[PDB]
Homo-oligomer: A and B are copies of this chain.
Amino acid sequence: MKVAVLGAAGGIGQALALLLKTQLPSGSELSLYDIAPVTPGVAVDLSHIPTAVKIKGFSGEDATPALEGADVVLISAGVARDRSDLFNVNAGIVKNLVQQVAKTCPKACIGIITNPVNTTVAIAAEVLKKAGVYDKNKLFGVTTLDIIRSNTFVAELKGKQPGEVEVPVIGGHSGVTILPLLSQVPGVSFTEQEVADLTKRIQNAGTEVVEAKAGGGSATLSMGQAAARFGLSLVRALQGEQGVVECAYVEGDGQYARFFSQPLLLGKNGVEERKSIGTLSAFEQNALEGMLDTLKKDIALGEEFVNK
């Protein structure tokens, strides 16, 4: 299986590429692309790690050599911090990269990491549609960082093994759109104050990092970790492994919005089943309805960026 990382020279991309180099299965191939000229050397650096994963790095404007034969494409290109100017830049980047994906490896599974995910998977979808290669089963907004933060915060609050906690997270990927299903964590229960506090902490966790970094940026290492978990799940599922389940932001039945993060059974063709979000608590139900307009705006912003 071959994985391409577009945006490989960034903080998220290097973390991701490191975890993938040492965690992909033997006989996997890893290729790195970024416009930054260090990129062939990021690959060379990683190539000195004795694992059975072939790795190569590529720069320039054309991502084609990185993309040829790619089974999974993970996109983490873009900056983090006018606010209109930076969005236009990140959106432009996703639009371009996905267009390269569409030309070279249209049957790849595509993980969009670049933020704002609510909006950027919509951009991605529209680009793939205009190329005529859009498969809704193979495009994902990578929301996995929401899940692993949730697992961490629950484990610390409830004194649990952090690796034994797995919290479902549905909705979208920013602020009020992030909905952790704390009522569904097996063997743990929460107070209403705890639900309100945990939920707000999860929804604002990116700001927590930004603030402690004192202008040195947003989450990079946890995000590379999150994205690795997700890419390795897609890989496992593509190789035929069963019961691989991840939450991710995908185009589904449209009950809440056109794109929505829900539990997914993953398979040989990407999404094998969009699973039910199950029973919500009153607090969760209210949180779902209170966010829907926000998420629909995020989506529309992405559709308009492409279609004018």
Contact = CB atoms under 8 A, between A and B. Distances in A.
A221 interface: yes
A208 B149 CA distance: 38
Interface of A: 9, 11, 14-15, 17-19, 21-22, 26, 36-38, 40-52, 57, 145, 148-149, 151-152, 155, 161-163, 165, 205, 208-217, 219-222, 224-225
Given A15-B18, A18-B15, A212-B43, A163 B38 contact: no
A217 B9 CA distance: 11
Copy number of this protein in the oligomer?
2
B145 A221 contact: no
A49 B222 contact: yes
B221 A18 contact: yes
A161 to B, nearest CB: 6
A151 B50 contact: yes
Nearest to A46: B221
A14 to B, nearest CB: 6
A155 B48 CA distance: 11
A48 B214 contact: no
Contacts of A43: 212
Contact of A209 (B48, B145, B148, B225): B48
A80 B278 CA distance: 53
